[PDB]
Amino acid sequence: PVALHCGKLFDARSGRVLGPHTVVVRDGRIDQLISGLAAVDLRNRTCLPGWTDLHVHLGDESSPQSYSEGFRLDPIDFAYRSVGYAERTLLAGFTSVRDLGGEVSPHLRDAVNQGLVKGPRIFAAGKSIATTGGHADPTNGWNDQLSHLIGPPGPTEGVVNSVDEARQAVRQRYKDGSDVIKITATGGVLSYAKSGDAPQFTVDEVKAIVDTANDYGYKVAAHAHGTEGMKRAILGGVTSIEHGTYMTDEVMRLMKQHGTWYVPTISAGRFVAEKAKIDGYFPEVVRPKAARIGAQIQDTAAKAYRNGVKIAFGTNMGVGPHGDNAREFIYMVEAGIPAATALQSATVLAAEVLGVDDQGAIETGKRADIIAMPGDPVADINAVLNVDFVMKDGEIFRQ
Amino acid sequence: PVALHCGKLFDARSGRVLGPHTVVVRDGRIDQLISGLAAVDLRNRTCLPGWTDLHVHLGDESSPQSYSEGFRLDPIDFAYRSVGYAERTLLAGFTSVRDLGGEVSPHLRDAVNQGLVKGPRIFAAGKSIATTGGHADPTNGWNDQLSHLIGPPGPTEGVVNSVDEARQAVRQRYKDGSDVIKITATGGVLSYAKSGDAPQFTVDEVKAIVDTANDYGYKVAAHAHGTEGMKRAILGGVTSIEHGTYMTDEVMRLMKQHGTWYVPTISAGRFVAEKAKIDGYFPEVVRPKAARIGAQIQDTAAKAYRNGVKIAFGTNMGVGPHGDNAREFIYMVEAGIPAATALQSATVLAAEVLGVDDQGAIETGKRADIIAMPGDPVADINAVLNVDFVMKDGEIFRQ
Amino acid sequence: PVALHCGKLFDARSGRVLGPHTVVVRDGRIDQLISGLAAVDLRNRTCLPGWTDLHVHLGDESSPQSYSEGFRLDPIDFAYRSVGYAERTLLAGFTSVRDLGGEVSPHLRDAVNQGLVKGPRIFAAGKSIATTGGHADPTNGWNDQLSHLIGPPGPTEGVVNSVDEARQAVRQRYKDGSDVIKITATGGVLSYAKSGDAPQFTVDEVKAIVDTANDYGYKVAAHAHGTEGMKRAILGGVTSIEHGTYMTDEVMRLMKQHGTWYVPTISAGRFVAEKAKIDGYFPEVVRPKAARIGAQIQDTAAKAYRNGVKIAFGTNMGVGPHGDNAREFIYMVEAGIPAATALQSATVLAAEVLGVDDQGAIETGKRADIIAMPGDPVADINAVLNVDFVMKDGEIFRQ
Amino acid sequence: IATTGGHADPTNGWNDQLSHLIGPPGPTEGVVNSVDEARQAVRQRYKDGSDVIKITATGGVLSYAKSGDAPQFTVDEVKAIVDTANDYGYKVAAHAHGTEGMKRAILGGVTSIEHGTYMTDEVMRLMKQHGTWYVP
Numbered sequence A, B, C: 001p002v003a004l005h006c007g008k009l010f011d012a013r014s015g016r017v018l019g020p021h022t023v024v025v026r027d028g029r030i031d032q033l034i035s036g037l038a039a040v041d042l043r044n045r046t047c048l049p050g051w052t053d054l055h056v057h058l059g060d061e062s063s064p065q066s067y068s069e070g071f072r073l074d075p076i077d078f079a080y081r082s083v084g085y086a087e088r089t090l091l092a093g094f095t096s097v098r099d100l101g102g103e104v105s106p107h108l109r110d111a112v113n114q115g116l117v118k119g120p121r122i123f124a125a126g127k128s129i130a131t132t133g134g135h136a137d138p139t140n141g142w143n144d145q146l147s148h149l150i151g152p153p154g155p156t157e158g159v160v161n162s163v164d165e166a167r168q169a170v171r172q173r174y175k176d177g178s179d180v181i182k183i184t185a186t187g188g189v190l191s192y193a194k195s196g197d198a199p200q201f202t203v204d205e206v207k208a209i210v211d212t213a214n215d216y217g218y219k220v221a222a223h224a225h226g227t228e229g230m231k232r233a234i235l236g237g238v239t240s241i242e243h244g245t246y247m248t249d250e251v252m253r254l255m256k257q258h259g260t261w262y263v264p265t266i267s268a269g270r271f272v273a274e275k276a277k278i279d280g281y282f283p284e285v286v287r288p289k290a291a292r293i294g295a296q297i298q299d300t301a302a303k304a305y306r307n308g309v310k311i312a313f314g315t316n317m318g319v320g321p322h323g324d325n326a327r328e329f330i331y332m333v334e335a336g337i338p339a340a341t342a343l344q345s346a347t348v349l350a351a352e353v354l355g356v357d358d359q360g361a362i363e364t365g366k367r368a369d370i371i372a373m374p375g376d377p378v379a380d381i382n383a384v385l386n387v388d389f390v391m392k393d394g395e396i397f398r399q
Numbered sequence D: 001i002a003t004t005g006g007h008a009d010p011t012n013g014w015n016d017q018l019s020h021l022i023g024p025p026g027p028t029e030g031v032v033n034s035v036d037e038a039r040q041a042v043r044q045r046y047k048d049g050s051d052v053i054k055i056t057a058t059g060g061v062l063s064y065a066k067s068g069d070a071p072q073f074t075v076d077e078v079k080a081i082v083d084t085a086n087d088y089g090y091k092v093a094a095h096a097h098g099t100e101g102m103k104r105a106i107l108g109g110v111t112s113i114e115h116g117t118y119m120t121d122e123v124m125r126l127m128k129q130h131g132t133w134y135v136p
């Protein structure tokens, strides 16, 4: 039981910064909210709900050696790095995240929930689902010896080529303890493959995946760069799109008609564009794709916001360094999105995307996830980089 | 050739207790029934047809170590326990049973039929059919090493994900010598999985299973806890439902329209509810499911009987201790079902569910399966716990 | 606590039948022995210690279909037969046995010790150790397809070809829970191989097996028909020889010098000799060997007894029908061995062979294993076929 | 490093299905039964980045096996392990409860003994003569 005394409170639902309030926390939930027991002196700060990042990869981080480490290291080696990744993410103000790829994240989520290590609340997708040769194919770029030794991937490994295989892949993700489903509708930038935006799913396969996920209470997030794959994913019935780099007017119209969410991930685009200029950082099959695709993300976000598409917060922090997720707010504001809208996209709209109703706002009965900063983020978005108070489930991790 | 002199005889077909009769048994069948050679003095007892339990698991029994014994013991070790299980079941008055899961039961049936060991007449299902990650998936809860060593289960192992796979699974059950088919339409309580009532079969897969079973002369029994899976199983065309914990008015209407049988298994619900309170008895992933689902079985049975659904006798004695199946009668009567109806549900309606016509009543030409108790079970249902005479196929096992 | 009143008591250690005595049993051991509480009336019987059979195969029985059942049945099917085998063996007066081959016997021993089924105390050897193509090779007679599918047997399967392999085979028998070691030094009669008496072990391999067994507290029993293999086994340091059909004067001299035990197993020889005359009972590769070797067992036993070799009791009841082990006494007496010596060879000398000191005689502090028969076995050996009292560990199984 | 069925055998207590699926352990898995296998086991420990060698000379308490103190190594196998470790700059520590296994480990040339529960006067004399360390 603790009472927090804030000088200003950000109303996520209304998008307005109110005056002094007092928040009483008991049993890990907000019990009372008074306008006007242990106590924490925050009267010179602005209190906001904890942020949610809807696209992270906590099991990895980009580096010059990332394309040769997979053949020499084991996942146990990556867990010890994920410890620090998760701690740095939590201490920056993000009390929950949506992990969208990797087999290390479910274990990290279990460890964090058991109290073994520090971190945010993790909604883990597990192994991503692709087609043969797709962006998430685990054996892209292997030589003949290794490929023959391991054999062709199947639904158990996340590679599907028919309706029944998609059904089995979703059921296998459920069997391994996932919270959400991720598919790669088109090609990617960082994969050891040739194409970057070609359609790699059919409409029927997407429909089968979505129906199976509906049976099991899951949501589906689709990775898409090109127009045709994005169109097929939208028609299939996915919940959100991740890298709509080549969104057109027709795609935006379909998104508005169907209510699909859009998660830009501007930070990853900027990072890959910057790293493409360095010689030898990327493999020769990856550099042209990164150079071409990383320079068309901010414009797409600005156009989508202007056209009325629903936008949510996500950074793809497995590409950039973990713990610097808060610069996506600055990028979004510089892209034309108002500061209040950008802050809402990470608190309440993020909770809508996740499908939960016990977080996202400072209201009675909700989880006590509260953060604070000295400045006013609405007046100046640059204040999001100085977070000095973090609370998650009623436990204070930073003061 | 023996003549039995009973003081009272229970007419299963009419549900009434008649007066003194004489039963003459020759060649293992009832030859004559006289109202008014070796002889057995039963003139101070009530003679009834042998009981049938439509849901047992003779190859296993619940215990505190049941979740770690599967990795250290072999089926040969379980057979030596099944010997005593079957003997105790037979001596309690149950001359036939329907085994609904486990690969040890066909062998026990063969041994009992050859006269090697004592037991009831067994209609064995063999391996139960599920989907990937389903309630009957044999590899739920295994770590990565064992899962990779054994590989993903297929139709040969009872795991199906399409119409053709369901066809092959039914044919493989036929190849291994089954008498009936069992599928798990929803999640369960005692499996090492997350869900307990979500739908795990599609209507088309159920239809394929039922059609294939029809080609081979089989009946299909469906395990179902949730509403949607139960609805899909009923629409597919199964013969009976096993744990309709969350039956609603629409489900009952469909059951009445289609003529589906309902087997409550109240004993297992009570047992799991009682054991959930003990700390450490169940794994942490099983305890909440048991606590939530075991407390809503008697009410469902009472509602189903009130609404006119057809009810048959079954206990799920693999959960509770074998040889105490007769307490299901007391539970049924305490649930509002009349004693005569409860006794009929185990003799004639059970024979209807099984699909046979040579047992279930004391009539000329039928199998000589006769039991007797000192009291009158109709007047007092508690008399079913004192069975002192058992005869099966004309052979006396208890006097 | 029970008191037994016998009219005559057989002193195993002295080999004499004494007069009336009273035996008091408490906690499963003999507490008092009085010459002159519950009570059992045995005053018209002769009480002897429970018998021990040093060569049985409780997991199998010879029959016309025994050479095609291994490809269609599973060990679980053989366990249900072993139940009756063990019960019949125990009820005939044999309270302990030494099982010398088969993987079903350790499980039967565990089940009997846990009280699940009735039977004698079992000292199980497990898988027998042989060389490639030897008498105990599990893949003798298989076609090319099956042989290629299963691969060549190694030390894990009981087939050894060097010193290190013998060491590993003994350690693997220890790992699987054995009580004694068995090796086949020569060829056999009932195996699907060509030879019947050729040497199949070298002296060094036998020495390695014996040394490894000594490290683990085991005894070694050797199957041997021919002279050279028997000589090699004796020189290696085994504890007993099983079928010394072709024993010579030099072999007997070595046996006397080293103190090796001899177990004739006359019953199996007579059985195979009788069955060889039936057409089609044995495969054509087995019939000549059986006909030639089964007719030279009684003479060998008589010669060995005349020459002063130490003789112990064993029948090989896996060949003959289980539960008729007591005819070996009649055969031994008809072979020239005195009745008292024959009875001693099954009570005290058998305990010496086993390596235990808590059984074999009716003495204070020993296990309460007592049997009784109406007649006097010393005066008439034919009285051993009428055993009406059996007690094991203080529990009465027959009265 | 252990022998078949030894205290450190990774497959002790498994049923037939799992044992058949994984197969019998060899030197790569740390189970040795001869001199050459011990050599290969030490080299495989070096290949996987070890700093010291551990062997189980006798049975243990917490393993899913029957015995607790019986000797599970021969003197020659211990000697081979120690020689191979000497070639690679390693030390050898021996787990031992019973007297005979402890004696064999000391004679083989190990550096320390871990659970000398049943140490006798002769074992202590050998330890003093050879300079072996004792870790209670």
Ligand SMILES: C[C@@H]1Cc2c(Cl)cc(C(=O)N[C@@H](Cc3ccccc3)C(=O)O)c(O)c2C(=O)O1
Binding pocket: A057, A060, A100, A101, A102, A128, A135, A136, A187, A188, A189, A190, A191, A223, A243, A265, A268, A269, A272, A293, A294, A297, A316, A318, A319
């Ligand atoms: C293990 C982990 C999994 C993973 C997966 Cl499944 C997918 C991506 C991914 O699709 N990234 C984007 C990165 C990107 C590049 C440019 C513009 C926007 C985003 C891409 O390749 O198109 C991705 O970047 C990662 C990743 O960071 O590594």
Ligand SMILES: C[C@@H]1Cc2c(Cl)cc(C(=O)N[C@@H](Cc3ccccc3)C(=O)O)c(O)c2C(=O)O1
Binding pocket: B057, B060, B100, B101, B102, B128, B135, B136, B187, B188, B189, B190, B191, B223, B243, B265, B268, B269, B272, B293, B294, B297, B316, B318, B319
């Ligand atoms: C080997 C054997 C096979 C087996 C199978 Cl296939 C299924 C069940 C089973 O579905 N039991 C029910 C037990 C139960 C629990 C609560 C209320 C009613 C019934 C369940 O888990 O929902 C089940 O209990 C068993 C069992 O007893 O072990």
Ligand SMILES: C[C@@H]1Cc2c(Cl)cc(C(=O)N[C@@H](Cc3ccccc3)C(=O)O)c(O)c2C(=O)O1
Binding pocket: C057, C060, C100, C101, C102, C128, C135, C136, C187, C188, C189, C190, C191, C223, C243, C265, C268, C269, C272, C293, C294, C297, C316, C318, C319
């Ligand atoms: C499974 C079981 C194991 C077994 C083993 Cl390991 C060995 C024998 C065996 O060696 N029997 C003897 C039978 C025999 C035949 C003639 C004279 C004496 C004995 C033989 O074949 O020479 C043997 O008969 C048996 C047996 O009965 O089946």
Ligand SMILES: C[C@@H]1Cc2c(Cl)cc(C(=O)N[C@@H](Cc3ccccc3)C(=O)O)c(O)c2C(=O)O1
Binding pocket: D007, D008, D059, D060, D061, D062, D063, D095, D115
């Ligand atoms: C994974 C890890 C490895 C391990 C190994 Cl390799 C060996 C032991 C071990 O030998 N422990 C001793 C524990 C013990 C017991 C009684 C007296 C002293 C010590 C034993 O079992 O005899 C041991 O305890 C452990 C252990 O703690 O688990």
Ligand SMILES: [Zn+2]
Binding pocket: A223, A224, A242, A243
């Ligand atoms: Zn992506």
Ligand SMILES: [Zn+2]
Binding pocket: A055, A057, A100, A101, A316
């Ligand atoms: Zn991504």
Ligand SMILES: [Zn+2]
Binding pocket: B223, B224, B242, B243
């Ligand atoms: Zn069920």
Ligand SMILES: [Zn+2]
Binding pocket: B055, B057, B100, B101, B316
């Ligand atoms: Zn069941």
Ligand SMILES: [Zn+2]
Binding pocket: C223, C224, C242, C243
């Ligand atoms: Zn033999």
Ligand SMILES: [Zn+2]
Binding pocket: C055, C057, C100, C101, C316
């Ligand atoms: Zn034998």
Ligand SMILES: [Zn+2]
Binding pocket: D095, D096, D114, D115
């Ligand atoms: Zn240790």
